[PDB]
Ligand binder design. Structure first.
Ligand SMILES: CC(=O)Nc1nc2ccc(-c3cncc(S(C)(=O)=O)c3)cn2n1
Length: 836
């Protein structure tokens, strides 16, 4: 309302990367009515959250403790070490011992209860009445089986968490277009195309008379559609598309209020080149110079026979991307209530609901009137997401899913945070039950609120079609999470803006081909000194690792990796005085890359291992951290003590000269200090390899540029860059099992058996993996075919083929590999250096 209360706005913006008060892509005020429509949702939670509990965010699960670890509780008890300065006693603890209570046997049994347990090094806290074993720092420690180092210090000041308090038939008059600069070849023709849409189910389709392309065409032509006015389903999208195809733009038919839209509109259009989710937007081209601008006028019980119920659960058991027939659609829609009893039919039910009719929609709501089983039913997350995807426009159906997501402990939302944040490009309006459920859970704790942030900031920054929508949603969150949190976002905003002024100053002097002249590194450091003068603030949180405080600059260790694009190998002194070791913080800082792709893939992989935990299985997939910090630029985790599969073959055998086999087995032997740990690492390698097969194959990215498979000095391995044979299983890996070439041994005997037992494990979940993939492509990738590319995963998971068929299929897929050798990788070798 005044001078100091207007300076707040010039900050938020600087942090969002878009001025939410700038009006230059706006035919109305859904804009505000979203922001406003969010004050309540915000400060409703803001208040509701326990302030001490917000500030101490104790990462806690409630899932059953893993059988490979619960059995692995050898002595049947746990041990915890606690520090001060010098003194640091070790303590015996029971898998019941409250993290609160383990001081009532340390301040009474060793000697008042106002200091809490932290973790040595991190911004973590172990507080609350949920057993030790239910802490995800502890689990992750015991999983890998480490010592547990705590340091006693005050509950942090949660006073900083302070918040800055007619009715017949539809028509539309297409009036013209303008595209100022047009020249390319010679004479072409053009026409517009208006469609009624309710979730890519296209109620109608209409054309105009083809008039030759001059720079400023005209028609003045109405478009009398077939379907009625009252029979228009909410979340009606009017698709407008110029054909030559060519250009595209959209308009919601119904208003966010409810008003059937009216008036004159100078909507600007996006260009197309050569489907994708980024094609169902409510926002237009915010450049009013080189864009096309179309001008318009708007002036307005169920019980049945046997071989029907049978020839129906058939339709139930079908995978999600399996087609449905008019034949199908009727059987379902008819048995409606008999179709409710099985939740495993819900997407498939509402798909079979053409929403043209007024009457049907109301009957469809009488279907929800007795939502009965769905509410009381076992939560299956896949079946839930499947309802929040591309296909459903109805602001009631999408609400039935969110309703079921409500019941998820943080550690689960965290697993799925990415794809639901991506899934907002799909709710048809702005203000939406999910859009909120996001803002909600994200204020309910801290650790969601962080990841939320850069997830939003990633899409606000590079993705034009959603910067409006996401910038509103974010702005709403940033205001209401307290400067306490908000002064770490400030840190991390300055610091990458610093790590840009340089990355792009170094990006200046590139000859072209892979090189790093003195010239370029000499300056790398010399630059860093002015980022070391009143511009970095002491430290900053590691974007991908919330609790990690990256601090001071190791300028002597920063470099510029020879790689094609020029990243920066930077390292950082952890600013935590109560650390435990002394390796710094290596962080790759690339640029010229869109990261949302790599980033989304880690969240697949993870889910794949969380799935395997329910089967009681481990495969060691090391999915490093990665984040899209701003525009065509981000930063990636540096996994200490690892190397590439490329450098190794390079380090024993010559330039490209052949590919010797045993090479690999020694590299480990020579990095194993103890006589044992060569077996202990082989234990970790075989398990680690098997996952980067099932997964690398299911996702269908298993044959990868030779230079891009990595491996820790500790047996474990992990595929790195996901820039762009069923899977990489090269002869040397086979030799690390005990097979020189098509034989079997007590470790390979295991290899086969692990992949498969895991493949069926992952198969017993078919549906989930598909509804990801589909969303994953829609929100992430280029020009994916709404069949072809979307399909592949169907084959990989081989729906239908009963267990004994697929169990062989994978065992034989290993054979598909075990017949090619290096011939693949060597073809990737000579793919480099003279192969036009
Ligand atoms: C010891 C080491 O170098 N470890 C390590 N860990 C990782 C994890 C990820 C990546 C990486 C992943 N994607 C892309 C890149 S880049 C800098 O080529 O764009 C690098 C590279 N490394 N390197």
């Amino acid at each position: 309302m005044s001078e100091e209360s207007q300076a707040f706005q010039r900050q938020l913006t600087a942090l969002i990367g878009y001025d939410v008060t700038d009006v230059s892509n706006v035919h109305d005020d859904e804009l505000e009515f979203t922001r406003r429509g969010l004050v309540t949702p915000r400060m409703a939670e803001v208040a509701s959250r326990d302030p001490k509990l917000y500030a101490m965010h104790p990462w806690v699960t409630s899932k059953p403790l893993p059988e490979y670890l619960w059995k692995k509780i050898a002595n049947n008890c746990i041990f915890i070490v606690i520090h001060r300065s010098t003194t640091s006693q070790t303590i015996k603890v029971s898998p019941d011992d409250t993290p609160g209570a383990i001081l009532q046997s340390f301040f009474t049994k060793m000697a008042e209860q106002d200091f809490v347990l932290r973790v040595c090094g991190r911004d973590e806290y172990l507080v609350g009445e949920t057993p030790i074993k239910n802490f995800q720092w502890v689990r992750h420690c015991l999983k890998n089986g480490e010592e547990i180092h705590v340091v006693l210090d005050t509950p942090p000041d949660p006073a900083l968490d302070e918040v800055r308090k007619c009715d017949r038939k539809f028509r539309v008059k297409i009036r013209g277009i303008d595209i100022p600069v047009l020249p390319r070849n010679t004479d072409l023709t053009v026409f517009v195309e208006a469609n009624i849409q309710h979730g890519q189910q296209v109620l109608c389709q209409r054309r105009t008379s083809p008039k030759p392309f001059t720079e400023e065409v005209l028609w003045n032509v109405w478009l009398e559609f077939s379907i009625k006015i009252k029979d228009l389903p909410k979340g009606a999208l009017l698709n407008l598309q110029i054909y030559c195809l060519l250009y595209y733009v959209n308009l919601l038919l119904i208003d966010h209020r409810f008003l059937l839209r009216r008036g004159e509109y100078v909507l600007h259009m996006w260009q197309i080149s050569g489907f994708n989710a980024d094609k169902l937007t409510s926002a237009t081209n915010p450049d009013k110079e080189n864009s096309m601008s179309i001008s318009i006028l708007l002036d307005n019980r169920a019980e049945m026979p046997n071989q029907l119920r049978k020839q129906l659960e058939a339709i139930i058991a079908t995978d999600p991307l399996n087609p449905l027939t008019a034949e199908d659609k009727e059987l379902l829609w008819h048995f409606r209530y008999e179709s409710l009893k099985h939740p495993k039919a819900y997407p498939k039910l509402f798909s079979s609901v053409k929403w043209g009719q007024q009457e049907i929609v109301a009957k469809t709501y009488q279907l929800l009137a007795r939502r009965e089983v769905w509410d009381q039913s076992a939560l299956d997350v896949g079946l839930t997401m499947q309802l929040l995807d591309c296909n459903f426009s109805d602001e009631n159906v999408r609400a039935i899913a969110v309703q079921k997501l409500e019941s998820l402990e943080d550690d689960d939302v965290l697993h799925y945070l990415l794809q639901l944040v991506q899934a907002v490009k799909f709710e048809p309006y702005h203000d939406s039950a999910l859009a909120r459920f996001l803002l909600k859970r994200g204020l309910r704790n801290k650790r969601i609120g962080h990841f939320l942030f850069w997830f939003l900031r990633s899409e606000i920054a590079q993705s034009r079609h959603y910067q409006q929508r996401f910038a509103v949603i974010l702005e709403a969150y940033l205001r209401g999470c307290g400067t306490a949190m908000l002064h770490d976002f400030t840190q991390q905003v300055q610091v990458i803006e610093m790590l840009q002024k340089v990355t792009l100053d170094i990006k200046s002097l590139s000859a072209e081909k892979y090189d790093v002249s003195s010239q370029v590194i000499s300056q790398l450091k010399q630059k860093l000194e002015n980022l070391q003068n009143s511009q970095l603030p002491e430290s900053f949180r590691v974007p991908y690792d919330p609790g990690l405080k990256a601090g001071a600059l190791a300028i002597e260790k920063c470099k510029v990796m020879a790689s094609k694009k020029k990243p920066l190998w930077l390292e950082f002194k952890c600013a935590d005085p109560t650390a435990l070791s002394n390796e710094t913080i290596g962080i790759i800082f690339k640029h010229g890359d869109d990261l949302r792709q790599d980033m989304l893939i880690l969240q697949i992989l993870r889910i794949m291992e969380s799935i395997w935990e329910t089967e009681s299985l481990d495969l060691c997939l090391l999915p490093y951290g990665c984040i899209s910090t701003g525009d065509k630029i981000g930063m990636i985790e540096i996994v200490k003590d690892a190397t590439t599969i490329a450098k190794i073959q390079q380090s024993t055998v010559g330039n490209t000269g052949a590919f010797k086999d045993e090479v690999l087995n020694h590299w480990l032997k020579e990095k194993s200090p103890t006589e044992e740990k060569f077996q202990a690492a082989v234990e970790r390698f075989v398990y680690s390899c098997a996952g980067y097969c099932v997964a690398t194959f299911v996702l269908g990215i298993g044959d990868r540029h030779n230079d891009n498979i990595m491996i820790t000095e500790t047996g474990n391995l992990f595929h790195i860059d996901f820039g762009h044979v069923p899977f990489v299983l090269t002869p040397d890996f086979l030799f690390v099992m005990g097979t020189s070439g098509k034989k079997t041994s007590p470790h390979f005997q295991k290899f086969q058996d692990i992949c498969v037992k895991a493949y069926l494990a992952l198969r017993h979940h078919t549906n989930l993996l598909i509804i990801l993939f589909s969303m994953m492509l829609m929100t992430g990738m280029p020009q994916l075919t709404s069949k072809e590319d979307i399909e592949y995963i169907r084959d990989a998971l081989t729906v239908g083929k009963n267990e004994e068929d697929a169990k062989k299929y994978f065992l034989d897929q290993i054979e598909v590999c075990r017949d090619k050798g290096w011939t693949v990788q060597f073809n990737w070798f000579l793919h480099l250096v003279l192969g036009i």
